[PDB]
Amino acid sequence: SLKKLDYHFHSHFSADSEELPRKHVTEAIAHGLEEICFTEHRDFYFPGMDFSLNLPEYFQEINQLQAEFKDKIKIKIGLEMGIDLRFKSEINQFIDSAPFDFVIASVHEIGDIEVYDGTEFYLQKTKEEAQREYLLACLDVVQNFENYNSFGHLDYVARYGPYTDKSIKFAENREILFEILRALASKEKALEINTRLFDDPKTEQFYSDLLINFKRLGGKFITLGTDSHIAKRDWLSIHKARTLIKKAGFHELATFSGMKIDK
Template sequence: MKTIDYHMHTCFSGDSEANPREHVLQAIKMNLDEICFTDHRDFDYPIDSFELDVENYYQTIQSLKEEFKDKIKIKWGIEIGLDLDHKEEINQLIAQYPFDFVIGSIHVIHHTEFYYGEFFKNKSKEQAHQEFFEETLKCVQEFDCFNVLGHLDYIVRYGPYQDKSVDHQKYQDIIDEIFKTLIKKGKGIEVNTSGYRDLKTCGFPNFEQVQRYYDIGGRIITVGTDSHTSDRVGENCLTVVKKLKEIGFNDVSTFTLQVKDLMTID
């Protein structure tokens, strides 16, 4: 199986100062087969007004792709914040540029975000998690402009609760519908290795949910670190790949111009 990092942020994202060239050098050091840059674009982040400079971002990654073409395969992508209040703008942006790969993530729900805690005000943990998964289902039903759903358990990172963990059994019917919708649409999920930092034991989503996705019929899957600093590029990617093979996956998925590349069966 290939070892990839398909979720990386650089200085083109508002929450990173990383030099993309340093990401490439670290990926080579980690013996990765392929990487994809996926800097942020959210149309309604209530506190931060940063807007991705797509043209400069594209030219920078294309230059790196040429420079390192004999050492590592580099792809150009984006992490788009799926937001039902901005469906037209999101679809227009993705259609406008030749992205290799698009992560669709839920960062904002009805003008409230998770990072600074606005979303969690006056909600119990169960109410917050229920709303998060319900909104995720609505987004994967409504949007077609992405390749994989980003960090399904993203909600775990935040919230003013002593125990932030998700009791998946309470929401399994919704999560199963998310998986079934993705599979029907020919889309997949990612395993986001930042979960090892936050949960200490696994990625987002956890491997029980990845197994469930596989058992339902899901075969499109990527691995990404969600790295915002170069030292985290490739972190735990090999560990995840080994676990995916145990679950039954033949290979991770890679993309060119949003079309899934032919997979190598090991």
């Protein structure tokens, strides 16, 4: 059995969420989760929107919840760090400035163009081109940045854009995905299974292919998260992901304390 957890979600501390931290905790307890990790956004110099994070307030609030719910659920304090290698030193100073339990590395913008609905990123660009550019940016991060635990949402690019079918297929991106997966395994990083798009069977297929090939290429650590920006969760999607993880041959999920793997 896998530990019942959620290792990716956002509350009002993140610039694009307004949820109560307490409501995440009570929803988690109601479902019977054993452990959760808040992963609020920090992205440096983000285009169009400030993803800043008030660390004193964030730690204070979660620390109070840790004490209050100590006997009901384990609560960790983490970070979703948007990565851009141009800002590597500043990003590292930020990560090193507070005792985060867990850090997700994510790609949200490339060359100051946000990867999102309605941006220049998808303008006059085929889906195949957008996917390749997105995955090349992910590979660049994995090859040149080390200060994180898990690599976030590899299917992020498939959430957005003007295409009739936004899905991402493993086979169409096989070479770059193998390189990313092997690099993650080689550096003992976790692969995140992100359930945002798990309502779509093509998302399930994509993550199944990621999982099986990650195992083939030496991967060991898997994290699991909803990426929910509200307390309400799609538990069916979480259950679908847990099934895929077990079927791929992983029998444990990775959890972290002070950025070290719990053993």
